[PDB]
Coordinates of N, CA and C in Angstrom, one line a residue:
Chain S
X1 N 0.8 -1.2 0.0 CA 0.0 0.0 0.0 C 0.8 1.3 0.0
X2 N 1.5 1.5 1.1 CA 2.4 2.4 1.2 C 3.4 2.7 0.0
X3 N 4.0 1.8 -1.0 CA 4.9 2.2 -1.9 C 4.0 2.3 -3.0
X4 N 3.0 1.8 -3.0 CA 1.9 2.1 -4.4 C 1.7 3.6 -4.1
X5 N 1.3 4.0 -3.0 CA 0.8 5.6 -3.0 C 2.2 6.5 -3.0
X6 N 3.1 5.7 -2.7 CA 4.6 6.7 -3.0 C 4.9 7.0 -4.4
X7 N 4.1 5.8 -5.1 CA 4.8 5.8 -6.8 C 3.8 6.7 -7.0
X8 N 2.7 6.5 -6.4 CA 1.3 7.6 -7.1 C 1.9 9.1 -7.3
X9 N 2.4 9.4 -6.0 CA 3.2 11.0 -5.5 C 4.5 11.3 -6.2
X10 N 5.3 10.1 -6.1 CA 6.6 10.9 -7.5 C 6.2 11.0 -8.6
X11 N 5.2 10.2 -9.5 CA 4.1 10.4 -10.9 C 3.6 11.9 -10.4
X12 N 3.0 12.3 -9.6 CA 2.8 13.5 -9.6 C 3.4 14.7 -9.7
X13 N 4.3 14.4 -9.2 CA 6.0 15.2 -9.2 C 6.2 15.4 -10.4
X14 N 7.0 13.9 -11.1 CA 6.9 14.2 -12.3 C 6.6 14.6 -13.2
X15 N 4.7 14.7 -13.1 CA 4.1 15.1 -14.1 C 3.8 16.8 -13.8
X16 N 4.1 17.0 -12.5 CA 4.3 18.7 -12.2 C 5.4 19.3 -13.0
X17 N 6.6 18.3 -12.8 CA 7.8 18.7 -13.4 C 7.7 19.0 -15.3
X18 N 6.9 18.2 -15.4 CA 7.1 18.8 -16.5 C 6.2 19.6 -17.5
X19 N 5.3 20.2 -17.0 CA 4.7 21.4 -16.4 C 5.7 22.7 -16.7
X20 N 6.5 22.4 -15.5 CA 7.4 23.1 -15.9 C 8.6 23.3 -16.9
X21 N 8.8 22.3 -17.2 CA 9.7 22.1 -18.3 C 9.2 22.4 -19.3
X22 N 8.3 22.3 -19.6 CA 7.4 23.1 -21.1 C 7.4 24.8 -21.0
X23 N 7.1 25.2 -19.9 CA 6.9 26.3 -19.5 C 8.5 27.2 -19.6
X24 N 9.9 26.7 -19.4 CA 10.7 27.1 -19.3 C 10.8 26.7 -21.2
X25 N 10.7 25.7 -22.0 CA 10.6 25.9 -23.2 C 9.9 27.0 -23.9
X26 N 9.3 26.9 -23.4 CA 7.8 28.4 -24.0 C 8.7 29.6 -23.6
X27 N 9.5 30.2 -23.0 CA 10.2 30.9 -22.4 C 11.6 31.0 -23.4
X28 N 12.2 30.2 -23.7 CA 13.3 30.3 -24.3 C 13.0 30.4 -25.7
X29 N 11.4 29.9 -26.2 CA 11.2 30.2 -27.8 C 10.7 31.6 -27.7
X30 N 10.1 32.2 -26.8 CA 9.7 33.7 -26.9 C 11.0 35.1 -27.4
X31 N 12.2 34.2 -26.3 CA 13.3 34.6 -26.1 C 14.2 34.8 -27.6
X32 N 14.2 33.4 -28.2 CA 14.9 33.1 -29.1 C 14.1 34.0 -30.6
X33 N 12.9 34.3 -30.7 CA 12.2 34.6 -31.5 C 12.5 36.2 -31.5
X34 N 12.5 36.4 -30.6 CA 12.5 38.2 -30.4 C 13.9 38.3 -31.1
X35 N 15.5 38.1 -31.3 CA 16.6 37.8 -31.0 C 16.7 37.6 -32.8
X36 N 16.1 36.8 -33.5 CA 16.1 36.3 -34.2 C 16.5 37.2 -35.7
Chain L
X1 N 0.0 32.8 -23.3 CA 0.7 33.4 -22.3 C 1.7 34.6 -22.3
X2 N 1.5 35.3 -21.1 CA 2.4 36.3 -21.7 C 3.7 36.5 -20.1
X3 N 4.5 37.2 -19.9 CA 5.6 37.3 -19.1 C 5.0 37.2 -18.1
X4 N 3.9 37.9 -17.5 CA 3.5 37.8 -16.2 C 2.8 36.2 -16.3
X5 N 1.8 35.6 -16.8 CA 1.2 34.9 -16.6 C 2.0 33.8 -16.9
X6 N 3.5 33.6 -17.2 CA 4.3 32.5 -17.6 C 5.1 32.3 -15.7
X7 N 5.4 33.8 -15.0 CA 5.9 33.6 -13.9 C 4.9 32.9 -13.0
X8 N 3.8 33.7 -12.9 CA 2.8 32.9 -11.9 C 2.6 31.9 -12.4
X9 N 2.7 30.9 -13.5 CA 2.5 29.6 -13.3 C 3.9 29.1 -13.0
X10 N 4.8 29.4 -13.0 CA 6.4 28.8 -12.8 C 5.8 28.5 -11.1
X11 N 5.6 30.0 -10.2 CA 5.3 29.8 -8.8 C 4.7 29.0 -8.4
X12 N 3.3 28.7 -9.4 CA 2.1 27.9 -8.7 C 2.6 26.1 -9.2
X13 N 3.3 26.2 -10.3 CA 3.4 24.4 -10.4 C 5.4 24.3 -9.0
X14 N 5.6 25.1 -9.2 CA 7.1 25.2 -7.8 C 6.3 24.3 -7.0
X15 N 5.7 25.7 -6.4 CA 4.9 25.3 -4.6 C 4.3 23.7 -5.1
X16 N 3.6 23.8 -6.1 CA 2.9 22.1 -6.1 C 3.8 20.9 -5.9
X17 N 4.7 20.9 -6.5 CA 6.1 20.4 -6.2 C 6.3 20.1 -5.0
X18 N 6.8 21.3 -4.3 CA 7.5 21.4 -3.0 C 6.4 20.5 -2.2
X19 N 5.1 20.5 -2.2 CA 3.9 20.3 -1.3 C 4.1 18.4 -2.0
X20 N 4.0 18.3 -3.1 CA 4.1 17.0 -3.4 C 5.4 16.3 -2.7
X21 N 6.5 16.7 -3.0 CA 7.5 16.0 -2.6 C 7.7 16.1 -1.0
X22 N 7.4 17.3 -0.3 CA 7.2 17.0 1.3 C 6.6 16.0 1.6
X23 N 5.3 15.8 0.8 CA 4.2 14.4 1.5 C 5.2 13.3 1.0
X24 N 6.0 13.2 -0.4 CA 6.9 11.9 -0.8 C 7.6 11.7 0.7
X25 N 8.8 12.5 1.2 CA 9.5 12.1 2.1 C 8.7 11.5 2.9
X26 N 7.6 12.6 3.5 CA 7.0 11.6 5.0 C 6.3 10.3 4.3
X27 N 6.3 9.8 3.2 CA 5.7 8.3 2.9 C 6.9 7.8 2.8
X28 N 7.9 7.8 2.5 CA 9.1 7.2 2.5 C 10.0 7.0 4.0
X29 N 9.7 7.7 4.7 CA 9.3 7.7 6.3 C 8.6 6.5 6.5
X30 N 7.9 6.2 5.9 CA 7.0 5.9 6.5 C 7.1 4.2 5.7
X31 N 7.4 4.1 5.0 CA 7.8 2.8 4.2 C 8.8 2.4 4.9
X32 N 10.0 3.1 5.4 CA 11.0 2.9 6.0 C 11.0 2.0 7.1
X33 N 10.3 2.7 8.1 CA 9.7 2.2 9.2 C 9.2 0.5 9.1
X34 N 7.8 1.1 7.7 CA 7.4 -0.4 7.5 C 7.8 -1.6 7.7
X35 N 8.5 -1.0 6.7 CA 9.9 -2.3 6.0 C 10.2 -3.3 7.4
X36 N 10.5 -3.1 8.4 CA 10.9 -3.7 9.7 C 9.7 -4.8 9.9
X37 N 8.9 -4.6 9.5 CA 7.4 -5.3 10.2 C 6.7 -6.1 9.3
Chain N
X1 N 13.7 -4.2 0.5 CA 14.7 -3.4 1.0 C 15.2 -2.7 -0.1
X2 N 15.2 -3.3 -1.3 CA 15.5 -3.0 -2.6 C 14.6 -1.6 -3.0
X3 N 13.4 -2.4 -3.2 CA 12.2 -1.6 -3.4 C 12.0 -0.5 -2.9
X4 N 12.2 -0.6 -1.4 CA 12.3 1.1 -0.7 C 13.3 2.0 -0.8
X5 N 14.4 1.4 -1.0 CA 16.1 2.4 -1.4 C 15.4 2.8 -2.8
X6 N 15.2 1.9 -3.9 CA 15.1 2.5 -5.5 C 14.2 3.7 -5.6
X7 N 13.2 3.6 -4.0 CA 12.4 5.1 -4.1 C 12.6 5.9 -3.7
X8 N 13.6 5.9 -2.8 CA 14.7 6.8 -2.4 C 15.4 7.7 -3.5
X9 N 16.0 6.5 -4.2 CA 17.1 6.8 -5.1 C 15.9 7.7 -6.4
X10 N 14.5 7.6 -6.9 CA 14.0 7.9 -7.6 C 13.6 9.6 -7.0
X11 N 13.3 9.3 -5.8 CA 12.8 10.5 -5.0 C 14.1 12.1 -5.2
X12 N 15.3 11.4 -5.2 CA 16.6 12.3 -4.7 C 17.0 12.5 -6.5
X13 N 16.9 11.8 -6.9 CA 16.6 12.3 -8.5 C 15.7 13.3 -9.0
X14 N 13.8 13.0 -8.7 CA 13.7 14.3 -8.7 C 14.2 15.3 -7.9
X15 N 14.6 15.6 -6.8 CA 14.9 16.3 -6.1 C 16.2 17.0 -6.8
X16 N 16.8 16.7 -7.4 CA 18.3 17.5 -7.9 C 16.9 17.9 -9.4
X17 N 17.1 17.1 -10.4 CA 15.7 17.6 -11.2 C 15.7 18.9 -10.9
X18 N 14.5 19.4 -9.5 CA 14.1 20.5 -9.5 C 15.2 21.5 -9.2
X19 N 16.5 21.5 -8.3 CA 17.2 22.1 -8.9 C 17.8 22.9 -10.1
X20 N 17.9 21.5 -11.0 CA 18.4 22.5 -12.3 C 17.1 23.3 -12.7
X21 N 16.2 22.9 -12.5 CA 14.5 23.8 -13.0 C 14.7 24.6 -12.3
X22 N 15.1 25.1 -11.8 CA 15.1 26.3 -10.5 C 16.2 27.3 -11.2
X23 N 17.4 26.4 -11.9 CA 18.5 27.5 -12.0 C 18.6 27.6 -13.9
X24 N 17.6 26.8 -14.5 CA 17.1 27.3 -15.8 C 16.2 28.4 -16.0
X25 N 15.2 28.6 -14.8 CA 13.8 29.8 -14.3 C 14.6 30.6 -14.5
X26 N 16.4 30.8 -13.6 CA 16.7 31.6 -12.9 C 17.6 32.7 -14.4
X27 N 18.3 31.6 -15.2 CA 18.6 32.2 -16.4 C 17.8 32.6 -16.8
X28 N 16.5 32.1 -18.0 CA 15.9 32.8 -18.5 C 15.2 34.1 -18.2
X29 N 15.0 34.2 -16.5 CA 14.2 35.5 -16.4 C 15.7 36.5 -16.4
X30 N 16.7 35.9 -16.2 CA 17.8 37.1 -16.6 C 18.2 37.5 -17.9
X31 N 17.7 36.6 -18.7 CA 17.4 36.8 -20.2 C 16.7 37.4 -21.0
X32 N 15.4 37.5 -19.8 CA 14.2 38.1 -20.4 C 14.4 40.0 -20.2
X33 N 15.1 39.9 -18.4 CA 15.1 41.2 -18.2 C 16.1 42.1 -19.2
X34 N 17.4 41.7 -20.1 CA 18.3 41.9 -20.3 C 17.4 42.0 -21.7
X35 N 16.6 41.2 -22.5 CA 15.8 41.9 -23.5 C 14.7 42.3 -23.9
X36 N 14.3 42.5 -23.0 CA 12.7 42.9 -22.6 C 13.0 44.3 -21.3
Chain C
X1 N 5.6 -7.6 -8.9 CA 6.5 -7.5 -10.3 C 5.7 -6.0 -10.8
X2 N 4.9 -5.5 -10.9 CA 4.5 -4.1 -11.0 C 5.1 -3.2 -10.6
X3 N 5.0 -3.1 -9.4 CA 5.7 -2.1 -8.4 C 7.4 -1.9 -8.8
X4 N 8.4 -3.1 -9.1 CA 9.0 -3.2 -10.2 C 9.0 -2.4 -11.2
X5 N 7.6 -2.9 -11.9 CA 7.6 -2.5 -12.9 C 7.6 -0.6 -13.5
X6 N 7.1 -0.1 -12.5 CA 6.8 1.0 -12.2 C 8.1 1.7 -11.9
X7 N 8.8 1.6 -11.2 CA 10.0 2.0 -10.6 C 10.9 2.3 -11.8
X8 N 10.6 1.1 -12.7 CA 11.5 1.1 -14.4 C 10.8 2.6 -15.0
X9 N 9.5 2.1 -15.2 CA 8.3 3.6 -15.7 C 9.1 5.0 -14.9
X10 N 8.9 4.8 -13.5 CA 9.4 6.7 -13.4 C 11.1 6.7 -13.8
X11 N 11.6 5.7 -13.3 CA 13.2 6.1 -13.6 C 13.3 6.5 -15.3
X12 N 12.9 5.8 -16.2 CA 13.1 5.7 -18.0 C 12.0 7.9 -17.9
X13 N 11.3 8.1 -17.4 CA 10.2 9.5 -17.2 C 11.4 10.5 -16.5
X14 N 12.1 10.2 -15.7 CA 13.4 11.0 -15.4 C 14.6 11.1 -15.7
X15 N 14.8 10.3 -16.6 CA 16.1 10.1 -17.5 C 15.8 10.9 -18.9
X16 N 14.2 10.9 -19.5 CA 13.7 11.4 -20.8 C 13.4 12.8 -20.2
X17 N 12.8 13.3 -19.3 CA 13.1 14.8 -18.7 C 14.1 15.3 -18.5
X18 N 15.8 14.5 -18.1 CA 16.8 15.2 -18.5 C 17.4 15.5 -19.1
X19 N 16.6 14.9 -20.3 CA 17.5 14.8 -21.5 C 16.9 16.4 -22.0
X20 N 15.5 16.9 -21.6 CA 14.7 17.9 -22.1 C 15.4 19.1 -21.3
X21 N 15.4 18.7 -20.5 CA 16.5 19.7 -19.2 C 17.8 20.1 -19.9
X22 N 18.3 19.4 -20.4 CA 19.9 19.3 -21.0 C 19.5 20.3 -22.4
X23 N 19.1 20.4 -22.9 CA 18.3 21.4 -24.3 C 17.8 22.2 -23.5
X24 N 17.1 22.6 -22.7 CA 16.5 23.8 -22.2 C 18.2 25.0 -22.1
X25 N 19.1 23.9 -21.0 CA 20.3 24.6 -20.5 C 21.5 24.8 -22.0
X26 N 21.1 24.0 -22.8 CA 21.8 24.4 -24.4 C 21.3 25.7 -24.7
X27 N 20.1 26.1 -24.9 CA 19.0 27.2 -25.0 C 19.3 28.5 -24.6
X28 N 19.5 28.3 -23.1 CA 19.8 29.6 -22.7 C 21.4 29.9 -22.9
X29 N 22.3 28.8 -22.9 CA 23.6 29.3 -22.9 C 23.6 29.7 -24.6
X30 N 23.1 29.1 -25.7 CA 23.1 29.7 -26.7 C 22.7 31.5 -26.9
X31 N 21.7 31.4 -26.1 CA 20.7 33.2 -26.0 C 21.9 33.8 -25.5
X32 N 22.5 33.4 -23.9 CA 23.3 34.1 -23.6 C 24.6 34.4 -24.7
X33 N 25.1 33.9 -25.0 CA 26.3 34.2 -26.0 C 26.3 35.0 -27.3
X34 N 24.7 34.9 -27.5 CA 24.2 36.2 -28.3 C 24.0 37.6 -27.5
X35 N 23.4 37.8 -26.7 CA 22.6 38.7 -25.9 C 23.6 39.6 -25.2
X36 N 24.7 38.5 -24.8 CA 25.9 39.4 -23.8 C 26.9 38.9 -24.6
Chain V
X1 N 24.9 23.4 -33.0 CA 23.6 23.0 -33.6 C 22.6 24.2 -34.2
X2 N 21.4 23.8 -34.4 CA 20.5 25.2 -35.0 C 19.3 24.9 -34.0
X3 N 18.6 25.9 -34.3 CA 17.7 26.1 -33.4 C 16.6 25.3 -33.8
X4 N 16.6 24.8 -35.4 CA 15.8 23.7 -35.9 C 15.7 22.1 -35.5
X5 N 17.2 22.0 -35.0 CA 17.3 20.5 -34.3 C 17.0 20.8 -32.9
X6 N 17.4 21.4 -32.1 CA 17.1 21.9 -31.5 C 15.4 21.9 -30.7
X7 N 14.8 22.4 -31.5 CA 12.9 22.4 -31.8 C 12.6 20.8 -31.7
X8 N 13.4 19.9 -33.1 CA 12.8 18.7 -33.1 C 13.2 17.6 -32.1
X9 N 14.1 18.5 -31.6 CA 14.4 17.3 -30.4 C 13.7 17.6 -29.2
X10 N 13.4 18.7 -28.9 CA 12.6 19.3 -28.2 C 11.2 18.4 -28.4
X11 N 10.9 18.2 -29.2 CA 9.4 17.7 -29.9 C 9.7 16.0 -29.5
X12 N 10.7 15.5 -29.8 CA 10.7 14.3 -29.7 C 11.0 13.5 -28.6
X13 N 11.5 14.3 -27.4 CA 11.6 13.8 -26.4 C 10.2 14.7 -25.4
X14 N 10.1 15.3 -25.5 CA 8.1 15.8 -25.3 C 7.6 14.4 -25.6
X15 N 7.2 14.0 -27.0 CA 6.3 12.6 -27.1 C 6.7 11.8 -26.1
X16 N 8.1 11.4 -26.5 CA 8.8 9.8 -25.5 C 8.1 10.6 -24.5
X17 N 8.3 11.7 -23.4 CA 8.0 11.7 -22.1 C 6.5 11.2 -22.3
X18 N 5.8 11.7 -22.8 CA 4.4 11.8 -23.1 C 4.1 10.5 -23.1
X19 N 4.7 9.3 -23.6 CA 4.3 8.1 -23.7 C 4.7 7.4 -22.5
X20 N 6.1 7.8 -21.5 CA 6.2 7.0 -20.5 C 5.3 7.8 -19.3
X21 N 4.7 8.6 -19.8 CA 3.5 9.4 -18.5 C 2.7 8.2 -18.8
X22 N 1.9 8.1 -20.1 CA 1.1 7.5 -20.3 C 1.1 6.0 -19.9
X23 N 2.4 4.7 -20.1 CA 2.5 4.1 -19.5 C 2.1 4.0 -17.6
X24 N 3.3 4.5 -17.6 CA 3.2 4.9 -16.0 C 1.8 5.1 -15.2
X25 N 0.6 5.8 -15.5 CA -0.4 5.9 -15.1 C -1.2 4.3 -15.4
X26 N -0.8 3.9 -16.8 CA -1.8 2.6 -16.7 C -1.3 1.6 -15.7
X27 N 0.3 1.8 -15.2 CA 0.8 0.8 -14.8 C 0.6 1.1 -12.8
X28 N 0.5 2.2 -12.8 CA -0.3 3.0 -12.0 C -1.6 2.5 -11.6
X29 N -2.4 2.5 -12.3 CA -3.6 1.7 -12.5 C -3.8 0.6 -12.3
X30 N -3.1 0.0 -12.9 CA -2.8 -1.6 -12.6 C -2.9 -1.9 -11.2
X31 N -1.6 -1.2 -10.6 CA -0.6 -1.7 -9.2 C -2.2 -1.0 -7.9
X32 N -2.9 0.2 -8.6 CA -3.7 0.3 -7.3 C -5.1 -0.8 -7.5
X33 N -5.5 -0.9 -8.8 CA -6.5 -2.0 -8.8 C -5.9 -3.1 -8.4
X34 N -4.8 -3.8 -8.6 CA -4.4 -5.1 -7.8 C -4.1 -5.2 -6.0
X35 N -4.0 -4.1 -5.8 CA -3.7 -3.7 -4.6 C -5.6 -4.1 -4.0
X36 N -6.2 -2.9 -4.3 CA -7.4 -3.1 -3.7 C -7.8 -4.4 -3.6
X37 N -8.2 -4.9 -4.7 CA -8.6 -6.6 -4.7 C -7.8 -7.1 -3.6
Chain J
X1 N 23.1 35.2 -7.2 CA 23.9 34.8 -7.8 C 24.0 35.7 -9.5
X2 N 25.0 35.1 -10.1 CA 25.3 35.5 -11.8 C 26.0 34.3 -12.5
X3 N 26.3 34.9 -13.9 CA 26.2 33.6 -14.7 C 27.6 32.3 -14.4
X4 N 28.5 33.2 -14.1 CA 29.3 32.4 -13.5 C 29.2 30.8 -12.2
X5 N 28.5 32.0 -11.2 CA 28.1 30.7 -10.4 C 26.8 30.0 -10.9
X6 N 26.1 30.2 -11.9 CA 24.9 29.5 -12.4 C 25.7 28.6 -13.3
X7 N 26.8 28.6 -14.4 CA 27.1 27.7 -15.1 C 27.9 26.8 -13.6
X8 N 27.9 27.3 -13.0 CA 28.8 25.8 -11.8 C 28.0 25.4 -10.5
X9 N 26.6 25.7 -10.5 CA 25.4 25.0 -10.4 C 24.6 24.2 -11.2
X10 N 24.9 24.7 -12.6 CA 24.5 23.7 -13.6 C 25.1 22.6 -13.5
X11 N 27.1 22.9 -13.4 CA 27.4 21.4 -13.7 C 27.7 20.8 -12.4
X12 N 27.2 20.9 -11.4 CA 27.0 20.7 -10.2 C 26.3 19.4 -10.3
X13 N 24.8 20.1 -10.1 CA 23.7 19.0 -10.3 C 23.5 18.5 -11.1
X14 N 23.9 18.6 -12.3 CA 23.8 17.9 -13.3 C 25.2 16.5 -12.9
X15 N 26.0 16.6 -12.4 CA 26.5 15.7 -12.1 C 25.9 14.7 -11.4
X16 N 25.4 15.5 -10.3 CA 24.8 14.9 -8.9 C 23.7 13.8 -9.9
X17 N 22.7 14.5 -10.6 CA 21.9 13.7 -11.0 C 22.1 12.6 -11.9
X18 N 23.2 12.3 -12.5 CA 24.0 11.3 -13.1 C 24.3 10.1 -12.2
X19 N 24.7 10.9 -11.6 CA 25.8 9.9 -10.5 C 24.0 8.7 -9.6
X20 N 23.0 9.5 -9.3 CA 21.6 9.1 -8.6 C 21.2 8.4 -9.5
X21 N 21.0 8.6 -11.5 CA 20.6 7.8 -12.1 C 21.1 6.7 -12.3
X22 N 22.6 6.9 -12.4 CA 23.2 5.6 -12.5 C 23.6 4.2 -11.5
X23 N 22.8 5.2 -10.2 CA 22.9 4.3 -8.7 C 21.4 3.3 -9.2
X24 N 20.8 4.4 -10.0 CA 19.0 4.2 -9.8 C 18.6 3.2 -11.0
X25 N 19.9 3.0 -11.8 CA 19.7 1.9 -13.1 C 20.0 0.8 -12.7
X26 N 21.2 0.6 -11.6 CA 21.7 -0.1 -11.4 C 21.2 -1.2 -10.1
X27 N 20.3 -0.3 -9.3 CA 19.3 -0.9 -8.5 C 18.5 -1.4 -9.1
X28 N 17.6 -1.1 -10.4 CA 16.7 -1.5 -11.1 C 16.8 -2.9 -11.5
X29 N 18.3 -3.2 -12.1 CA 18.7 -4.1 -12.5 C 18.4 -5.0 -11.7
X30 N 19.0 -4.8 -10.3 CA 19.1 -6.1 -8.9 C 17.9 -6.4 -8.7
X31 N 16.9 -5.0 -8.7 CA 15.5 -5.9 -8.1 C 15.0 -6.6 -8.7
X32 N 15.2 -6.4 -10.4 CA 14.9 -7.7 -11.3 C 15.0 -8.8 -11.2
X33 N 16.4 -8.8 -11.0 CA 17.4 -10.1 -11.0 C 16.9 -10.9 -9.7
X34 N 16.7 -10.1 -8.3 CA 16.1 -10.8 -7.2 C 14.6 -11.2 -7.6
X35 N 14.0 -10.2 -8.3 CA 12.6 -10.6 -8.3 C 12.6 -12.1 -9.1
X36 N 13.1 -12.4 -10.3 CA 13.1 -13.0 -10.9 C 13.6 -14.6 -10.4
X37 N 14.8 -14.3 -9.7 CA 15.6 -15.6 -8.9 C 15.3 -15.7 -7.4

């Protein structure tokens, strides 16, 4: 039980994480476009 | 999105993070313990 | 015993993860300010 | 053997995020070497 | 490199992640429906 | 901080998290190999 709801919570992590990781992509094409 | 609404979501998915991975340790705490039993 | 260290070991992975996300945020908004 | 199996699932999900992380940090050090 | 490989690689490790999310939750799925039972 | 100490936080953690994956592949492997034998 305990490590099934642990995996549940780093899946959530991760899927936060990359949330952000898109978000810092969207950031660096704004970046790179203006520049261009 | 624009610059402001790209930061507040950077903030709001952070904190969700931080809040997720604080409950990971205390389950891993808590598996830890298990493990013994 | 395996099982609980590998979630360890998965946990402290993301954990560095958010690190570098933290110091990619931290470039680009010095990127942004610098052309914007 | 799931739980296993799963452990494989997030580690292969945090190895394919660094690899997106490692291009994000290409990104900016590119912008920077323009910019400054 | 160019900013064109760059983009596609961007795009192609997006999918892969996209697909081991998607694994992951069925497998996810799996591990808490076998659990319950 | 400035770019200086951000390029040696980059290669900081980015080490760090090599060194955790390659602990974390290599565990993968064993619980296999135990699960299996």
């Amino acid at each position: 039980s305990g490590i099934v709801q642990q995996q549940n919570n780093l899946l959530r992590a991760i899927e936060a994480q990359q949330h952000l990781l898109q978000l810092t992509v969207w950031g660096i094409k704004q970046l790179q476009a203006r520049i261009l | 999105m624009t610059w402001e609404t790209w930061e507040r979501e950077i903030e709001n998915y952070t904190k969700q993070i931080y809040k997720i991975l604080e409950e990971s340790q205390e389950q891993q705490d808590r598996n830890e313990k298990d493990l013994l039993e």
